[PDB]
């Protein structure tokens, strides 16, 4: 996921999406291109933590 | 065992010798007999020792600095030098035995004639040949070798050796005959060479020399007597330098491609 967004921006920059303004602003371009192929159907469920029980200890006393 | 290398077009060499330089009998003495004589002696001197697995050129470099191995050095130097002489005077290095080629017109290359002018103050190749013939007659009283050598500074110069003197390693060039008298200038050259050999830190007392031969002429009696006779060695050197195989001599000059 981290390498999919960097590639999206690198391409959106190499394609050029005021030279003076090209030294101050950091707006890379359209939101769609920056987040291409990053949707709710593939990103959310893959990053969720604490999703699998891997250990359990039960004590009595 | 060191064996005599096979030469291209050997059947022609054993029948008509080397045209314009040596006859059939003259070439049998210089190569087929002398080279056998040297290789056999080298095998007897080096058999059973580590030197047996090394080519003659490597042997001379390994033994150049060892005083008591001079006998091995002399044999190795003579063998290497003799095949350097027999190689550039040979009609054709390629084996046109089945191609029956009789048209080998080899001429000095442009790189060779450019380095001659640069190193000899604009002198032409013909003039340099005259200097080579003169140097051989006045500097080599007896046996020896005539070389046109190139040094690390891209300069071609003329070196003469007495008996079996290697061109590669200046401490063993044997260019000064100390049996006769020497001038103060020659003694200075010898004294300077001794100082250079003493600056080396190696336990073998060896120095770095990058000189390489370009043309080799055998000045031994085994090469000219039978065909030219005592006193006619300058007519022999003239013929050799006029009938050199320049496909070999040109290839000995580093181009850098």
């Amino acid at each position: 996921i981290n390498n999919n967004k960097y590639n999206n921006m690198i391409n959106l920059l190499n394609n050029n999406n005021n030279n003076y303004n090209n030294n101050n602003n950091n707006y890379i371009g359209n939101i769609n291109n920056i987040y291409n192929n990053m949707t709710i159907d593939n990103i959310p469920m893959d990053i969720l933590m604490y999703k699998y029980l891997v250990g359990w200890s039960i004590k009595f006393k | 065992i060191h064996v005599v290398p096979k030469l291209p077009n050997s059947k022609a060499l054993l029948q008509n010798g080397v045209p314009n330089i040596l006859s059939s009998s003259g070439f049998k003495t210089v190569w087929f007999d002398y080279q056998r004589y040297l290789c056999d002696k080298l095998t007897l001197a080096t058999a059973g020792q580590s030197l047996e697995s090394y080519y003659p050129f490597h042997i001379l470099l390994k033994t150049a600095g060892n005083p008591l191995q001079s006998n091995i050095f002399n044999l190795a130097s003579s063998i290497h030098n003799n095949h350097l002489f027999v190689e550039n005077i040979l009609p054709s290095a390629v084996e046109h035995g089945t191609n029956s080629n009789a048209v080998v017109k080899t001429e000095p290359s442009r790189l060779f004639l450019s380095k001659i002018k640069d190193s000899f103050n604009g002198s032409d190749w013909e003039v340099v040949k005259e200097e080579m013939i003169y140097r051989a007659e006045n500097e080599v009283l007896g046996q020896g070798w005539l070389f046109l050598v190139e040094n690390n500074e891209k300069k071609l110069f003329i070196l003469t050796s007495n008996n079996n003197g290697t061109p590669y390693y200046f401490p063993r060039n044997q260019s000064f005959d100390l049996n006769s008298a020497i001038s103060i200038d020659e003694f200075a050259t010898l004294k300077q060479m001794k100082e250079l050999i003493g600056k080396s830190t190696k336990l073998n007392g060896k120095v770095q020399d990058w000189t390489m031969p370009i043309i080799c002429v055998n000045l031994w009696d085994h090469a000219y007597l039978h065909d030219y006779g005592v006193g006619n060695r300058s007519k022999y050197v003239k013929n050799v330098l006029d009938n050199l195989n320049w496909s070999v001599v040109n290839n000995r000059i580093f181009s850098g491609i």
Binding site: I1, N2, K5, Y6, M9, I10, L13, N14, N22, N23, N26, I28, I34, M38, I43, I47 | -
Partner: protein, 60 residues
């Protein structure tokens, strides 16, 4: 004419050391050098723009 008068000045400074390849050979050699200095500027700007966004959306 800065676009052209700065490049003429550059050759004037080189003319000092010069004290006609300079008509077409040097003139071309200069334009190309400027193109390589204007492309490095654009490369540096891209790094700034990429370092000011969230290159690492999910973890880092």
């Amino acid at each position: 004419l800065k676009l052209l008068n700065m490049i003429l000045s550059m050759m004037n400074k080189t003319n000092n050391n010069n004290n006609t390849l300079d008509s077409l050979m040097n003139k071309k050699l200069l334009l190309k050098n400027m193109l390589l200095d204007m492309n490095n500027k654009k490369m540096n700007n891209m790094k700034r723009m990429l370092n000011n966004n969230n290159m690492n959306p999910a973890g880092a």
